[PDB]
Design a binder for this molecule. Structure first.
Ligand SMILES: [Mn+2]
Lengths: 293, 7
């Protein structure tokens, strides 16, 4: 597997025509899936990470925005990275997006980290774009290969014992961090339970405790649930993604939670920015932002 | 508003 050749071809389109494709070979992409899947399984499902690092929210197949984020924050391994999921679907270039991320995971497995989002799930990506992209540009066998890889992604991360990171949010079934560690892989995303909530749930300002989620699955949770959770586990901040926020980042519950959304120009009702959160050596948080066009 | 599985 020629990682450097794969990465070079993926980076070559920097500054190129609007949405120029990078078409790797089917064998190259299969290698990316198999080697990265092996690495994911060898590392904990609940990652224990160290700052400084940069944390990104949703990319949703916006490959050229992923390149801008690496341009702004430093291409790996110049900075450590944690991504919070939702790499595929919706966008025009999910394949380039997930392939560059998997290539970086294989090249720098101790300095580059990818969490699972709710779109790293076959039943979701059958509807929202990644399936059609794989079928159009490769074949469905490769799409199954991606799904086998997605099923081994880690689900959460804790940065220096203080910042809890996941794609969706909290769970009414999440009482101990060991519950996350006991989850076996490979696994699909269930329509209910701890793993589902970690990838699907949302914080809500107008809910007290746990409420119904407009997405039709999982729950919403209020500011007090966040406060109680941070106290019980001696944490300072919840870092999640999953929800489009206009500024690319939005704090919640008196800065006890932050939402990161890294795909700009995504929403149809408002022009959103994309934000990447820089966490320095002492866990101080700043932002690098893709302003809307 | 893209369709709530989610603007
Ligand atoms: Mn999501």
């Amino acid at each position: 597997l020629n990682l450097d050749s794969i990465i070079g071809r993926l980076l070559e389109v920097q500054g190129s025509r609007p949405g120029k494709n990078v078409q790797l070979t089917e064998n190259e992409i299969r290698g990316l899936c198999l080697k990265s899947r092996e690495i994911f399984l060898s590392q904990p499902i609940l990652l224990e990470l160290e700052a400084p690092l940069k944390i990104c929210g949703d990319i949703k197949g916006q490959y050229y925005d992923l390149l801008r984020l690496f341009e702004y924050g430093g291409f790996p391994p110049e900075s450590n990275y944690l991504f919070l999921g939702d790499y595929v679907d919706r966008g025009k270039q999910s394949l380039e997006t997930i392939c560059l991320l998997l290539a970086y995971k294989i090249k720098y497995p101790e300095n580059f980290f990818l969490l699972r989002g709710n779109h790293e799930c076959a039943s979701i990506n059958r509807i929202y774009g990644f399936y059609d992209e794989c079928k159009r540009r490769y074949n469905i066998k490769l799409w199954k290969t991606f799904t086998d890889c997605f099923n081994c992604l880690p689900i959460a991360a804790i940065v220096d014992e203080k910042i809890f990171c996941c794609h969706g949010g909290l769970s009414p079934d999440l009482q101990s961090m060991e519950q996350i560690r006991r989850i076996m892989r490979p696994t699909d995303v269930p329509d209910q339970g701890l793993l589902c909530d970690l990838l699907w749930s949302d914080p809500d300002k107008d809910v007290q405790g746990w409420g119904e989620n407009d997405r039709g699955v999982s729950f919403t949770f209020g500011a007090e649930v966040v406060a109680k959770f941070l106290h019980k586990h001696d944490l300072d901040l919840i870092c999640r993604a999953h929800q489009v926020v206009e500024d690319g980042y939005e704090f919640f519950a008196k800065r006890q939670l932050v939402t990161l959304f890294s795909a700009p120009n995504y929403c149809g009702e408002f022009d959103n920015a994309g934000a990447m959160m820089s966490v320095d050596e002492t866990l101080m948080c700043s932002f690098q932002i893709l302003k809307p066009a | 508003x893209l369709x709530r599985x989610x603007x």
